[PDB]
Each structure stands twice: as C-alpha cells, then as structure tokens.
Enzyme design. Structure first.
Site, PDB file in Angstrom:
ATOM      1  N   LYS A 245      45.877 -62.672 -80.776  1.00 51.97           N
ATOM      2  CA  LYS A 245      47.106 -62.790 -80.291  1.00 51.97           C
ATOM      3  C   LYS A 245      47.020 -63.676 -78.957  1.00 51.97           C
ATOM      4  O   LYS A 245      46.482 -63.459 -78.000  1.00 51.97           O
ATOM      5  CB  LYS A 245      48.101 -61.664 -80.015  1.00 51.97           C
ATOM      6  CG  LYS A 245      49.608 -62.125 -80.384  1.00 51.97           C
ATOM      7  CD  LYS A 245      49.916 -62.231 -81.876  1.00 51.97           C
ATOM      8  CE  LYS A 245      51.418 -62.390 -82.126  1.00 51.97           C
ATOM      9  NZ  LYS A 245      51.503 -62.228 -83.443  1.00 51.97           N
TER      10      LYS A 245
ATOM     11  N   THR B 227      48.112 -58.152 -85.340  1.00 53.07           N
ATOM     12  CA  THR B 227      48.231 -58.943 -83.946  1.00 53.07           C
ATOM     13  C   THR B 227      49.342 -58.615 -83.190  1.00 53.07           C
ATOM     14  O   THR B 227      49.590 -58.607 -81.991  1.00 53.07           O
ATOM     15  CB  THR B 227      47.884 -60.463 -84.272  1.00 53.07           C
ATOM     16  OG1 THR B 227      49.232 -61.001 -84.890  1.00 53.07           O
ATOM     17  CG2 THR B 227      46.594 -60.840 -84.894  1.00 53.07           C
TER      18      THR B 227
END
Ligand SMILES: O=c1[nH]c(=O)c2nn[nH]c2[nH]1
Ligand SMILES: O=c1[nH]c(=O)c2nn[nH]c2[nH]1
Ligand SMILES: O=c1[nH]c(=O)c2nn[nH]c2[nH]1
Ligand SMILES: O=c1[nH]c(=O)c2nn[nH]c2[nH]1
Ligand SMILES: [K+]
Ligand SMILES: [K+]
Lengths: 296, 299, 302, 298
Positions: D6, D66
């Site tokens: 991320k 994520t």
C-alpha cells in the site's frame, strides 16, 4: 472578447531596490524586503479594436509578437527602479501602452516567486546568508493590474488588486462545525472539535492606487503582514465555520490597514478524516470552498 | 459577493441512457454515446442573502453542508434519466433549488471523465469490450449551468455553456507566422513553416437552452463533433496565426450548427523549438489568445 | 558515481516506418507510420576517471550534461532505424565510441505518443497526415545500459522494453474475497467490484537484437502488449490484481516466445461506492491510499 | 520479484512524544521537535514464498488486504511511544512481522509531512502558536527500512537509511563551471559566475541502526541539521560544479556526525538562463535538467 498575450513569463533579478520603512503591525515582524533576490511570474493580456484583422484576416501587421511581450517584461525588470511587485506591474503597463499606441487595454497578473533565507557559519558565527536562498513552494504575494487608454489618450487604472495565495493552515483544536441543516442528504456528523485545515487566497484593494506602489512605503500593505494577521485570528478564536473565520480575518485586516477598501477571500476546506479503525488521514477528493468580500 | 460549495465531486455510473438520434456533420463520424460507463467531476456553488449570518455570526442554521451537496449530486446521478452532462446539471440545479427555498442561486460546472473502448478476443473474435475501458487524460467535454430563484419564486437559467477542454493539436507543416512587428523588443524570426502546437479550450452557447439537454437530440451539439471540426479546419488551410485559426474554426462551428449563438476560444501556443529537422520543448512562456465568434462573423 | 541529463525531449518527422511486424490475435497492430515521432530521454554516465570531477572540482574529463543533450538530439536526426530501443542502442554505442573514458552509460527513453485525427479533403473524411493529437495516456518505454569493459569491448548490460501509463477499469466481473479477516480488517468481501488498475509492464528479450527492429518480425510492440492486457482482463473473472497480472504475463510469454520474462508494476485505484443510500450503483473517487503489486513472470510459469 | 502493498498511507497525529536532547552542531540551531503536530506518508511492501498462490491461482487465503495494511499503519501511529520517523518504521515493521508469520520481508518508506510554526498575538506579544501550523510543500525528512525474517525466525534489518528530500537552493553568485570538454557537441559557454540552482535529496546511513531511533537522542542525526549543513557549505565556498559541491557537503556531514557510515546524494541542476534581450536578469530554462548521484563514505 478579443485578447492575446503571454503567460508564465518568469523573470529573476538580484539587488532590486530594498523595500524599507513599511509601517509595522503587532501581528507581524515584517519591516521590509532586502530584495537581494527577487522573482516574478507575469501574465500579460492585451486588446484593442485595431487587432480585429489579426483574427479575421490573418494580418499580422499590428501584432506585437507574444515572444516580444516576454522580452519587454524581462527587460523592464532590469530597468525597474521601484520596490514592489505592484509598482513593477504599473511600470510595465504604462511603458507598454506608451510604446504601442494601437493597444487600448492591458491586463497584468504578477506572482511573486518566494525565496527564504538560509543559515551559514563563518568563523563560528551562524547568520543569514546573503548568497544562498531556498526556493519556496508555499504561500506567495500576487498583484493584478488592468489599464486602459481613453479616447483622449490619457491612461487609466481600471482595476488593481494585491494578494496572498497558497497559504495552507491547520489548527489542531478549537474549531467547531455544528448546527447545519440535517435532512435526507446529510450524513456529516456534528463536530465540536475538528482539526480545521483551510487553504486561503486573500486579495485586497487600496482606497488610493498610489499606496500599492511603495512610493510612500508607510502606506504599503505587505502580503507577509496579511499572512500573520490570518494566523493570529485563526489562533485567537474558536472557529464556527470557515465562513465565519474568513469574516473575522477580513475585519482584522481592515482594522489594521485603514487605507484598504475591501478584502476578498477564496478559501477551501481540506480537513482530515479520523481514521477508520487521535489519528487522522487524508479525505476523499471533494473539497469545500467559500468566496467572500469584506468592505471598509 | 458571498458563495460556498463543493469541488471535485466525482461520480461514476454504468448504463446511463444512451445518446442517439443526433444530427451528423461532414467533419465527424460521431453518431452518439453508448454510456455503458459515464463519469463526471462536478463543482457546485450556491448563494443567497439568507446566508449572510453564516459568515457574520457563525450561525449555521441555514447552511446546507457542502458534504450534503456532494451527497445530493452523487445520488442524483443514480436517478437521472437523461442523456447529457448538460441535462444532468439542469436536473441537479432544478432539484436543488426546489429542495432549498432559501438558496437564491446555484452555479454548476461539470467535466466529463472520458473513457475509451478497448479490444478483447471472445471465441477467436476480436471486438470492442463492453466491460473494459481505458481512462483518458486527453480532451473532455464540459458544461456550465447557473440558475436563480427570482424574488417572485420562479426559477430561471442565468448562464448555460457547453465546452471541449484539453485538446492538444500539433500540425507538423503548413503553418506560417510572418509579418508581425519587428522592433527593438523582437527576437522572433519570421517562420514560413512552423510545427504549430496549440492547446484549445472551446465553449459554445446555444440560442435555445433546451437544445443542450438532449430531449430532442437532433439539436444537440456534441463536443466530439466540435473536436473533429477543429482538427479538420486546422488540417485544411495554411495557418497564418493562432488568432486566425481559431476564427476559422469558430466560423465553421457556427455554419455547421445554426442553433448556436456564439463560440468562445481560449488557445495556447506550445510550439517546439528547433534544437540548438529535429525539435524540442521550449522555455515555459506560452502565448495565448481569447476570442469570441458570433453569428455577425458568418459569411 | 553518476551524472547525466533528464527530460531531453526530441521530436522529428518521418522517422523510418516500422513495418513487417508479426501479428497476434489480441491486437490489430501492424506497424508505425512514424510521420511524427517524439521521445523523452534520460542519460546517465559513469567512469572511474570522473572521480576528480567530484573530489577536486576538475572538469577536464567532464562531458557537460548540456553536451549530452546536444548529442541525443542530433542523433535523432541521423538515426536510420525504426524503434525507440534501436535509437537508444545507436546513442549508446555512438557515445561510448566518442568518449573512451566513459565506462558506463544508462539510457531511458519514453515515447511521446501522438494520435491521428480526422480531416475532410474535397468531401472525403480521412486520417490527416498533418494534424496529430498529443496523448497523455499510455506510452512505450525502453531501457538500455552499456559498458566499456576493461579490455575496451562494448557490451549491453541491461535492456528492457515497456508500456507505461495504462489505466484500465472493468465495470463488472471482478471479485476480491477470501482474504484475511482479523482485527485490522474493515474491507468487506466483494464478489462484484469495478476493478480499476494502473499497469506498467516491462519485458526482456532472450536475444537483445530482437528489440532493435532490424528483423521486425521479432519485435514485440508495446501496442500489442496493451491489447493482450485489455483482452485478458476482459476474458476472465478476476480474483485479485495479483492473479490478473499473472494471467496477462502468461499470455504475453505464450504469444511472444522470443521473450524471456515480463515484469509488472500495478496499482489499485478502484472507486468507492458513494456514501449516500441509493436504480444502479454510483461510485466515486477513493481516499488516497493505493494498493500495488510487483510480479515477474518467466518461462517457468508456462 | 513478488511483492505487494500500500502506498500513500497518510497518518497525522497530535502530541507525539517530543524529540528532545539532540546534540547540536555549529551549522544548525536544531535541538528537537515539539511534535505538537506530526504527519507521515508511509509506503509498505511485503513479500514471502507463501504468497505465491495469491498470484498463480487467485487464492487469497494468505493475503493481508492492502486496506488492512493501511489500518495497521494508522493504528500503530496511535500506539507509537517513540520520537522519530525512523523509530516509527521500526515499530511498524517489527509489529507486522510478529503479527503475520507467513511474511518473510517488509519494506517501508516514510516521508515526513512538514508543518511550520506561525505567529499569534496574546496581550500584544507575538509568539509562535501552539495551535495553528502551516503545511509546507518544501523539504521534508524521509526514512527507509527493510526487515526480513530469517530461517531461524530472528528478525533482521537488512537496509536502513534516513534522508532529506525536496531541498531547492539557489546561490546568486560565487559559482563557476569551467574547464569541461569542448568538442563538436559542446555549445555551453564557460561561466565563471553563475546563479547555481540545485535540488538536493540527501540520504545517510548510520553505523549502528539503534542510533536512528532517537532512544539516545544525542546520537540522532536530524534532517534539519543536514539541511543547514548543506546551506552553510554552499555559502562558504566558490563552487566549481554540483559534483564538487555535493562532495564537500558530504564531507562536512561525516565530520559533524562520526556515527554515520555514508552519505548519498541525488542532485539536480535547474539554473536559470540569462534573458535573450543594469543588473542581470534571468529566466526559466528549457526542460532538460542535469543530475548527479554520489556517495561519500567514512
Ligand atoms: O466550515 C465549514 N463550512 C461549511 O459550509 C461546511 N460544510 N461541510 N463542512 C463545512 N465546514
Ligand atoms: O500564432 C501566433 N500568434 C502570436 O501572436 C504570436 N506571437 N509569437 N508567436 C505567435 N504565434
Ligand atoms: O486485488 C486486490 N489485491 C489485494 O491485495 C487487495 N487488498 N485489498 N484489496 C485488494 N485487491
Ligand atoms: O555543475 C555542473 N555539472 C555538470 O556536469 C554540468 N554540465 N553542464 N552544466 C553543468 N554543471
Ligand atoms: K459524417
Ligand atoms: K490481429
């Protein structure tokens, strides 16, 4: 409805005449500008009825090339003997209309390119450098000027405005937004203590156009001073909305600077969200905004 | 003045009612919009004398929260049964003023978020996909709509414009810029064959506001058609300046679309330099032009 | 220890056309007219003999970065080949031949893409040979590194081609279910999301010569890669971006047996459903955090 | 060749533990950070052989979403009791590997979101506000950490770097660039007095990773101090090239901070052109920019 010109005319000069003798106010330490390094980004727009056939026929006989406007602006920064961005625009505008009699109107925007001082050490003593500056991408001073040639060939300022752009202020506490309309479209919770994050663009108009040029520097209103009023007012008061904050900033500006006629605000709301799981994060893109004028 | 509102209100939906039944022109193959995937970025601004105390006193009693305006726009894209961005703005504006009687004025800007078709093979057959689209960062349609509630409580449109933004066109030859003032400020050489690179933002105003909504789609003027007029006109003639190019584009637009009252241009010059032929990017300063063509300019 | 020049843009007309390419079912690509060609080049050079330019301020062996810019731009005029990859090889070989004290050069080239437009000539609407639209969408890329060895022979030390800036949204036919659900999970299972991916795809040839266009039937065009990516995304119900890029990579390697491997950098930019209760779904832009994936597919995956 | 994660995980917190007691140096007034307002932009990347089937088969059984990584980072800023961005990354990394045993590698980048103090008046006295801050788009501190789980289940830092990004400095005089190669490709005139405009990204590596965490703040090297060394060195001497400037900056950094092992520079040249047509006037150049990469050791 017919204009042409040049944008992004950058011009940088060293050792412009220093701006000194400005009247100080309690909210700001500002007392002038050394002008060791000065930068401006100018946009010029011109018009006139005699330009018609440049559009309708492709006749370029009366066309000042926009490239030449760029040369004009840059050369005039070298010969400018004044002390403010406002005075520089005035010098360019009068000079340009004096040079090109078929131009009936000129509009100029100038954006300060701000630089900040840096530290250097010499023989154990640290002090501000007179050589090394830091380019800032934060707030900056602006100026706007429109001038026209009248039928009797006198030149007249038809609009003039100064400003401060790109100020981004966050107040960690002491901000509420409550009492707004709640109906089928309202999901926003009442919030009595949000970390309000506001973008501010502030413009002001002088009662006397001459005060904007720095000729008598005690009457000049520096964008730096406007910045420091804005931060002081934001600090001092529990905010109830951005709307009411910009009202209070404007009132303080007009109180401190009686030579001003009006202050105009363009604000945006960029306040962070509380996280899903005090920690905050960036919101979704939609941003609030406000436009407001305060008059003297 | 006093206004407040919300910018960057994005909204995407699938299967908007298709735009069909449009009226064609020689410069463009445009025949409508499938509307399988539709996106818009909306800015809303509102005003009204009754909002004064939200500024002067911090009284929010009459404030529609800007977040609520965002909800209003997004929900109305789900319920919109029409076929154009212009009509969507009218639906939002009329609905909003009807809901909030103390609002005296609303101003909307809508920018199309454009998507392009892609190729897929299905059973040995390559065809346009009904599922996968490419997001485009090139030109896009725009719309502008302002509406008022008058003192007598009637509602009226007070400005309406449609547009095409972000068009970047380069014509490699067949462009001259000669005959301009050569004086002590001039370093630009005469150039009888430059690779003119223009950015175009084009806006048009209809004689009759209803024609912008798609209700009778044969009266609609599509941004795609305007684009294709601009490229054809640029191709067809030796240019003499950007000023004169945009004049000729405007004349063709008004000739092809007699339902239009006028067309406004904001152009920028981004022409490459010959390297210190091969060309390269110029220094930052850019030329620009602003010009309105009206029916008084027609043959 | 390196120095160089970035954002060296160069545009020319009538580069030699690329033709004679081998086709694939996913793509109608048949070549490049090259009426208008643009590239943005970054050049970086190194060599032990450059040390004193750093340690002492001695510029005697410094090729000015401005001169690197001139070198690149002039060599686009004299380049007689047909690909960006070949252009980089021509620049690199020429530069190391000119400057024998440079031990290494690294080049990045990014295509500046232009699209055809419509014009009417004598009542016939057709593609203009004069007016093009600059595109800010996907574009081809190329990477080339070359060294002068101690024995003065020249060798390519890395070569990759690519496709950058592809942004694809598939409105339905995507699931993301079965992931870990623990005290950090607020994401719901979603059996039908409008997956929006950004793709940057790079490929490596088994034989470096195949990248240059000399025998154009062995060239792998970024346009063809683009069209494989859109076809594969359409063809199958996605289960994650991870598995989508695996499937795209397998198809690329199957279609182009002259490739050794393919590398993906993907990002997830999928829209959120709107906050307001709702007629069909409406979506909007998410908060800034974006998912991403990096994955290499090799022949061992076939 | 298989990672996922991320980016743009922003997290802002008020009243982080203040950073106090940092050793000062002549070039810099820096002594600490009040931490009334703290912001960071984190990028997390993870890997592990047990993630293979998430790619090859579409099996998400071992996938930490994520989105959940974003939650993990943001919640850990709330529970972080330390004083530096480097220590925050260490906390996130160790915590993440301890939570998820199937993850064998984690890479973190943190970028400070810098805020500046502003003026406020009380009883007519102007002083820095404890409430209102200015968001800066200028230079900012950075940190990098890579951590792996070994076969014996020990956790190990494999890479660690701190940095300063986004510094843009212009020196109006006292800069030369002469003596470079002049051949068929050279059009640049020699210049004995140019207004050198450099962008600097500066990174440093500690001899002992523990020194980056602020636990003993006397050993911490603040990006603010690096900034101020850079401006002092640029000021002090006539430059001969950007190459030689970054060498001298790096030497001064290693002299002031013997706890550092190396300094790495990524510089760019953005010097203005003199105008086409009294003092000199300059303007923005065409887009091509010079750049340099250089490491100083010791
Ligand atoms: O200060 C604010 N003014 C507004 O109008 C508003 N609407 N939502 N949040 C808001 N905050
Ligand atoms: O088309 C052009 N119009 C102009 O006004 C101009 N000025 N410089 N170049 C120009 N090109
Ligand atoms: O395709 C996806 N892969 C992921 O790893 C992920 N995590 N959250 N959403 C996701 N979507
Ligand atoms: O400082 C510089 N280093 C360089 O390598 C260079 N090349 N052109 N100008 C330059 N300036
Ligand atoms: K047609
Ligand atoms: K085919």
């Amino acid at each position: 409805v017919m204009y042409y010109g040049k944008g992004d005319v950058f011009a940088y000069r060293t050792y412009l005449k220093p701006l000194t003798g400005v009247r100080t106010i309690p909210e700001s330490p500002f007392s002038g500008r050394d002008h060791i390094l000065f930068g401006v980004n100018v946009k010029i727009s011109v018009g006139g009825t005699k330009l018609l056939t440049s559009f309708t026929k492709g006749d370029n006989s009366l066309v000042v090339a926009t490239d030449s406007m760029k040369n004009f602006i840059q050369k005039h920064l070298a010969s400018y003997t004044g002390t403010t961005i406002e005075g520089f625009l005035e010098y360019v505008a009068t000079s340009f209309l004096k040079k090109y009699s078929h131009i009936e109107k000129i509009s100029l925007i100038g954006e300060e390119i701000p630089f900040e001082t840096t530290f250097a050490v010499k023989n154990g003593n640290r002090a501000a450098s007179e050589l090394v500056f830091k380019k800032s991408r934060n707030e900056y001073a602006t100026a706007y000027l429109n001038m026209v040639r009248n039928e009797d060939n006198t030149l007249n300022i038809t609009e003039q405005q100064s400003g401060l752009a790109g100020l981004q202020l966050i107040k960690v506490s002491g901000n509420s937004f409550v009492g707004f309309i709640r109906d089928e479209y309202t999901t926003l919770p009442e919030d009595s203590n949000r970390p309000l994050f506001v973008y501010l663009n502030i413009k002001w108009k002088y009662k006397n156009t001459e005060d904007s040029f720095g000729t008598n520097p005690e009457n000049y209103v520096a964008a730096e001073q406007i910045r420091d009023i804005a931060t002081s007012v934001f600090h001092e008061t529990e905010t109830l909305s951005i709307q009411h904050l910009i009202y209070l900033i404007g009132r303080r500006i007009l109180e401190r600077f009686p030579q001003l006629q009006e202050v105009y605000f363009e604000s945006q709301n960029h306040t962070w969200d509380k996280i899903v799981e005090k920690v905050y994060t960036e919101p979704r893109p939609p941003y609030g905004f406000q436009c407001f004028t305060v008059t003297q």
